[PDB]
Structure formats: C-alpha cells, structure tokens
Design a protein around this ligand. Structure first.
Ligand code: A1IR4
Length: 148
C-alpha cells in the first residue's frame, strides 16, 4: 500500500480518551489537550523535532474496542488557556492538531503488533501518550490508513 512510506524522521503516540465528545470537539476544531504529564511528553517530542518530521497521534476511546482515527500534532502546548472547554476541567491546556483519517478500526486488526518498549505488550493495551517505536507505528498507520 501507498500510505506513509518515507516517514523518514518521526515520533508516534497513542491517545486514550474518556470522552467521545472530546474526540468530536477535537475533530470539529483541530485541537487537543492531554494530562499534565501527557502535555509535557508530547510537547518535548514536538519541540525536539523542529519541523524535521511528523508527530502523529493514534486515537482510541477507552473501552470502545477500536481505534477511531489518526492526527498530526501541529503546534507546541499552550498551558494558560480557557478552562472548562473539555468534558473535565482536568484538561488544562491546548495544542493544535490536523486529523488525517477519521475512521473506526477494530482492535482485532491491530493487537498482534507489540511494543518492545512496553514490555512486549500489544499496541491495543496502551495508556495515554504511550510512544510507539517507528517501525511498529508504520504498521499501525498503514493498517488504519487502508482498513475497509
Ligand atoms: O479523556 C481525554 C483525554 N485527553 N484529552 C481529553 S480533552 N480528554
């Protein structure tokens, strides 16, 4: 398949969400927020990249048994922003994103991909902002990119 070849330099992260409504707001406005340490993690991966490659985000609603799409981080993290705009006031902050695929891909299509940096646990077992090794990430993205 013809998706995501020549990723070159890159870093990929798992996004776990407790609110579909947050996902929809994120699609509607190309913005996201994570935890305090989630924000610090993605912030570093974004600032250290210096435009030289894409920071991609893989999205899954918790308990949903699927992934729900793919997006690219498009800015650093802003820590002083309007409170209370997400489902919980515990999401303080904002960075921009750009959604690339909005589609549901069942975990049955992805669970045989494992993260050697997560004690060999499957990709579908990740917590929020679990980083993915570039070579397994490429597998995930291509699986989602082309799922029918
Ligand atoms: O459940 C979550 C997780 N991360 N961000 C937001 S806005 N909601």
């Amino acid at each position: 398949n013809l998706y995501f070849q020549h990723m070159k330099h890159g870093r990929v992260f798992i996004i776990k969400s407790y609110s579909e409504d947050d996902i929809h707001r994120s699609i509607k406005y190309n913005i996201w927020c994570s935890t305090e340490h989630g924000n610090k993690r993605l912030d570093a991966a974004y600032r250290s990249m210096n435009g030289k490659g894409p920071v991609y985000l893989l999205f899954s609603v918790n308990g949903s048994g699927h992934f729900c799409g793919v997006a690219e981080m498009k800015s650093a993290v802003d820590y002083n922003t309007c409170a209370g705009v997400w489902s919980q006031d515990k999401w303080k902050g904002r960075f921009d994103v750009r959604w690339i695929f909005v589609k549901d891909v069942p975990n049955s299509q992805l669970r045989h991909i494992r993260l050697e940096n997560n004690e060999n646990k499957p990709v579908t077992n990740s917590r929020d902002t679990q980083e993915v090794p570039l070579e397994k990430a490429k597998q995930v993205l291509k699986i989602i990119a082309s799922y029918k």
